[PDB]
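Posted in: Structural Biology > Protein-Ligand Complexes

Title: Requesting predicted complex, adenosine-5'-triphosphate in pocket

I'd be grateful if someone could produce the 3D structure tokens for the following input. Sequence and ligand are given below.
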Amino acid sequence: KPNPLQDANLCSRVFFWWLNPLFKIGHKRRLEEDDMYSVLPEDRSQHLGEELQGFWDKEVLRAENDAQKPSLTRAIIKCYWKSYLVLGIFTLIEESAKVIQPIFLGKIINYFENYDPMDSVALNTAYAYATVLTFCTLILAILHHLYFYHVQCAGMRLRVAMCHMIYRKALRLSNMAMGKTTTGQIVNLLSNDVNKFDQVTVFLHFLWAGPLQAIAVTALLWMEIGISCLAGMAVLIILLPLQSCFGKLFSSLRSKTATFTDARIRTMNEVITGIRIIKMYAWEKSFSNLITNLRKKEISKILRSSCLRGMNLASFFSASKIIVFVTFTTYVLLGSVITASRVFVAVTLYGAVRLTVTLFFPSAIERVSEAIVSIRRIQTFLLLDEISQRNRQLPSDGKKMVHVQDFTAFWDKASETPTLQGLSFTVRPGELLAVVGPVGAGKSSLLSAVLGELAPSHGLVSVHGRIAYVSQQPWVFSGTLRSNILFGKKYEKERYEKVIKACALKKDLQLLEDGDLTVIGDRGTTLSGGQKARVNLARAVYQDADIYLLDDPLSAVDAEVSRHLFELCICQILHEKITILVTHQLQYLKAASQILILKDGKMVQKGTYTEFLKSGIDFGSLLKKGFQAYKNYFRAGAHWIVFIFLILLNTAAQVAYVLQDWWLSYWANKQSMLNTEKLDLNWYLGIYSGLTVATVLFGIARSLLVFYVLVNSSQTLHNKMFESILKAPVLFFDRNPIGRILNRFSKDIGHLDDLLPLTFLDFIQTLLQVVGVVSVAVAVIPWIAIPLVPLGIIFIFLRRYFLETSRDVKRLESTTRSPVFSHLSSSLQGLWTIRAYKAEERCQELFDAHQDLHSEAWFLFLTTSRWFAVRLDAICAMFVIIVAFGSLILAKTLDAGQVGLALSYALTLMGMFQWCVRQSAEVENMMISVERVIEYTDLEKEAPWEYQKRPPPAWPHEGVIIFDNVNFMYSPGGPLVLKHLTALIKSQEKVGIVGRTGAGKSSLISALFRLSEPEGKIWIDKILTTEIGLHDLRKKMSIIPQEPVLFTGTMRKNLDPFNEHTDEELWNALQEVQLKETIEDLPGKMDTELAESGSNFSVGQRQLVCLARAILRKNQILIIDQATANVDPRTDELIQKKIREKFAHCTVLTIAHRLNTIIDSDKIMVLDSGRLKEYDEPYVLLQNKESLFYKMVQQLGKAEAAALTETAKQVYFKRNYP
Ligand SMILES: Nc1ncnc2c1ncn2[C@@H]1O[C@H](COP(=O)(O)OP(=O)(O)OP(=O)(O)O)[C@@H](O)[C@H]1O
Ligand SMILES: Nc1ncnc2c1ncn2[C@@H]1O[C@H](COP(=O)(O)OP(=O)(O)OP(=O)(O)O)[C@@H](O)[C@H]1O
Ligand SMILES: O=c1[nH]cc(F)c(=O)[nH]1
Ligand SMILES: [Mg+2]
Ligand SMILES: [Mg+2]
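-- Reply #1 --
Done. Output follows.
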């Protein structure tokens, strides 16, 4: 991958010519890492990191010498100033040209108003001034982009060096430092804060260019016009504190609305998660009411924020007109006269100085402040303590011995109890030493202390040679499994075969698709704990070390793999090297050569297994303690009348803005065509003031109207799509994951609320300004129309060409920015294992490779943007030059003011055109959010909540249930879960459900509740179920679900959301719940707000609340879903006794995984994969030995079978023969 920047002439380099092959490839097909362009060797991360290491270490040596604090800022400056000053020189000369251009404009105009048809020397001077103006425009619009690239490349180099520094420091930090900090912040700053370096460098050079430019412009204007320069500069400067005040107010309002935004996101996540339960309880009306209220409360604040944003933007639009109006009002009232030169000189100078002062200086100052904060945080992290080096790399002469004497170490020095006390043990190669103790006694602490990560407070420790160690928690860095096993060591086929046959990993190889080359992501999401432990053991054994340390490696695996691993990896292999192992399994201690008992940090007994057996101490005892999107989006706002009014207001404001300078030109022309008689100042000043105030008012009104319409459209879209999704069937929510359905609630709507209105308004404003300037340029000289068509077609083709390649780069960089973060996270998580081996330069090298790839993506992203910018500026400069030369060529018929207006607007098209193009690209890129929202607008709807045929309020009188050829089906074109159910359910009877967790169980509940449209005929009290509205059906059929889930809020709403009960009834029912005393201790008597899903409550309390809601809704027909899964037997017997003592007159359908709760049931469905097999009394069912219910009973055993038979028979005799 050669870098063409190596072979690039300066003429080609300035024009960015070398990117032509890459852009041709991007047009032909897509982009990928293969098409990537390798970075310059100087741009590599390793060299920058080495330089920054040298400089930072030098300054910290200086700081230690001088007895003072260090300075990352000082190090960075002393590293980069010598190579950053030349770009400052270049920006100085560029700004000199930028400020000298209007003087040449004034000279050319000065030629115009003194026209002489027969003169030639004046025309030659005019051409000379025009061509030096061409030089000025070309140098402003050509070399500026190369300077910008070099500035941003210096910033990128700085960011890369800082990242390499922070990773290198993180990989070599101490245990106390890790305890103080966390893996979250340490990746958070590297992901967010360091990115300020790629933005601060861009505006940095304007700190020393702003005031100098302002002073130069002020001096020029003081020379040109007179006293009005002070007034103009004062008005322009007063804008800045106003900008700061609006920024502060907007930030405060955004912080105020953030809490409402977070509350809405949290509650909508909650309803999405608990959507099956909320659908089965028919509280979606209350939830929709709450969401609507919160949405209105949020929309008020965001409407205020949008209004403030629009006011700020309109004030920006009218600032230049206000400044020039004040300046010229002072100019005329002082007693001076108006010509056609000074007018446009002042206008252009104001444009330039206003742009610099308002758009660059404050952004530069705030980015510098943010970068200083970033450097302060980075140095705060960097000055953290470091692990003391041990025995350098390897000076020892092998010394294959391990010894520990009088060892007492502290995990923390502040604690009073040493973790381990007075360790004394030595081990030799070929010894199978082991340690056994209670969980948490410090065996892992002993292992780590041997690893050297624990500072020896007392005694001596001597371990020599490279060490292989396995952590208790499995760790695998993301990548190919072969790479994880190899650890970076060279590949040996026979060794890999021996390891793979010894570790019994062939099963994992054949299970995984790629086998040995399978890709594993973060935290081993593609594998299991046992597989990860086996992988770690395989890596350790392949390392082929001398001292082996294992921390409970066989705990999270089965017996066969554990015995195979232990035997055929130690008993015939590790009997020659140093082996220290800790196990919670006592079976393997027979083969252990040495065994130690450790508890309370002190040794108890060390010896052989037979010696411990003779001692009589029990180890076990010790172990136990497009366009249509635009059309719909704009229609959702308001009717087209408001749209045409808005476009008319846009046109009126733009025409007034142009007419202000046109009136200046007309005033200059009329003054020139004179002669004493004096022009009536009142008329012209009044018309000028009227035009200026019209511009300001129309801009304000336009911005407010645009924001109002867009915000109203967003609100209407959100309401419509939420109302649509709330009525969506459960199939949509089963198919779409929770994260996917919440993404368009938390992100797309957010963008539609706070970014699309402003961005669209800014784009339309810039487009109107550009089209107005071009219209002026055409109107002044009608002949400029001819080149305009080729210019436009060339621009359109260029935009398409650049956009067909920019998207690929912008997505490739985003994709490539994640692996560095993943690598940092995984390496930090496995830091103990990483430092156990001497190998860390390899980890540094892979980090360097990932950083190089990310920097390569950044480099291409920079170069493509610079190429597009230079092409656009070339076109704009061509326009400027053609306007100027046409004006000079046809000067015999024009006049000074008209020419000046034309050429000044041609001058100011610079930057405006670029901003318009960039904002158009951003808008067409980000429209995808409302595309997703409108896609969510029209999900399919279920049956209407209320039918025309309203059921009688008294139904059900009895509760007879009829199943007639009932077939349930999860989705169309899917398996038939239920097959022709035919049964009758009488009034006030108890029905059980048997079988297995493969018969459907919940399928019947889904059919009755109609989560999905079923097939067949079901009659409830001689009424066909399909003819009852969903709210008129589910409201009168209660259920206690799989997992009870309480909802965020108070108990009052969380029990009776629709509020048809009384406080006395609430307290009474809660008293029979027996949680009344449990709840009458909270800060609120009954209004205490609960945590998420009752985190402070127990599952039994959840079940009690559910049965409370059931008894309060007191419908005849109820269903219970596996009331006990892992609940304590006390709360179990409570819930069964309540359910059997409160529902004597209520029909109940019971489903459960255990027969004891349903052995007393009068009747039972026998279900098998949706097929009804038997239906009779349970004792009659078990009377037949061939019955499947009897087989299920006999599966458990005999004594429980006998008890169930006794209970069923006594129920049968008591009921049938009273
Ligand atoms: N980062 C740490 N800071 C303080 N103490 C620690 C740290 N890591 C481990 N420990 C100590 O290690 C013990 C917890 O280890 P663990 O529960 O894994 O059992 P163990 O007795 O060390 O050995 P084994 O893992 O073999 O069962 C506690 O004594 C705890 O204080
Ligand atoms: N969300 C789902 N989408 C599609 N099929 C499903 C879904 N949930 C379950 N199934 C399938 O439907 C059948 C029965 O579903 P279910 O899991 O309710 O049965 P069960 O185990 O007998 O009951 P329970 O869920 O009460 O334990 C099985 O084949 C199961 O794989
Ligand atoms: O010409 C411009 N340059 C930079 C900007 F941010 C902007 O709005 N306009
Ligand atoms: Mg431990
Ligand atoms: Mg199931």
